[PDB]
C-alpha cells in the first residue's frame, strides 16, 4: 500500500461520490454487497473494527485502515463530529479504489 495519504481522495468522494457514515449504515452496506471500500479510523472501538473487518471479509470488500484518528476522519469528511467508519458505494471522480 502506498504511503500517500487518502485525505484528498476522500474529499473527492465527499464532493462527487456516494457514501454512508457510521456503524449502522456501513454494516448495512457491507452486508447488502453495496460497499466498494470501507474506511476505519485508528481509534474506532476494537470490537467494532473487528466486526466491520469480519463482515467486509465475508463480502469480499476492501477495508482501508485510516492512518489517523476519528477527529481527522470526521474533518476529512467535512463533518463537525468524530467519524469512525464509512462505506464508499461509488468513488465518483476519486481514484480512491
Instruction: Tally the domains of the chain.
Output: 1
Q: Is the dihedral of CA 1, 76, 72, 39 positive or negative?
A: negative
Separation of alpha carbons 39 and 33, rounded Å: 15
**Hey, what's the cell of 60?**
469480499
Domain that holds residue 66: 1-97
CA distances from 17 to 6, 31, 47, 81, 96 (A): 15, 20, 28, 20, 10
Reported residue count of the chain is 97
Distance (Å, whole) CA 30 – CA 53: 10
| CATH number, domain with residue 4 | 3.30.1330.30
Place of cell 457510521: 22
Taking Cα atoms as reference points, which of 40, 39, 41 lies closest to residue 96? 39
Q: In what order do the strands lie in the sheet with 18-21?
A: 18-21, 85-90, 37-40, 62-65
Q: Are 88 and 96 in contact (CB under 8 A)?
A: yes
Helix (H, G, I), strand (E, B) or coil at 52: helix
Amino acid at each position: 500500500k502506498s504511503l500517500e495519504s487518502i485525505n484528498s481522495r476522500l474529499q473527492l468522494v465527499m464532493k462527487s461520490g456516494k457514501y454512508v457514515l457510521g456503524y449502522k449504515q456501513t454494516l448495512k452496506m457491507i452486508r447488502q454487497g453495496k460497499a466498494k471500500l470501507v474506511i476505519l479510523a485508528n481509534n474506532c472501538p476494537a470490537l467494532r473494527k473487528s466486526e466491520i473487518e469480519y463482515y467486509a471479509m465475508l463480502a469480499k470488500t476492501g477495508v482501508h485502515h485510516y492512518s489517523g484518528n476519528n477527529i481527522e476522519l470526521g474533518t476529512a469528511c467535512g463533518k463537525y463530529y468524530r467519524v469512525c467508519t464509512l462505506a464508499i458505494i461509488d468513488p465518483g471522480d476519486s481514484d480512491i479504489i
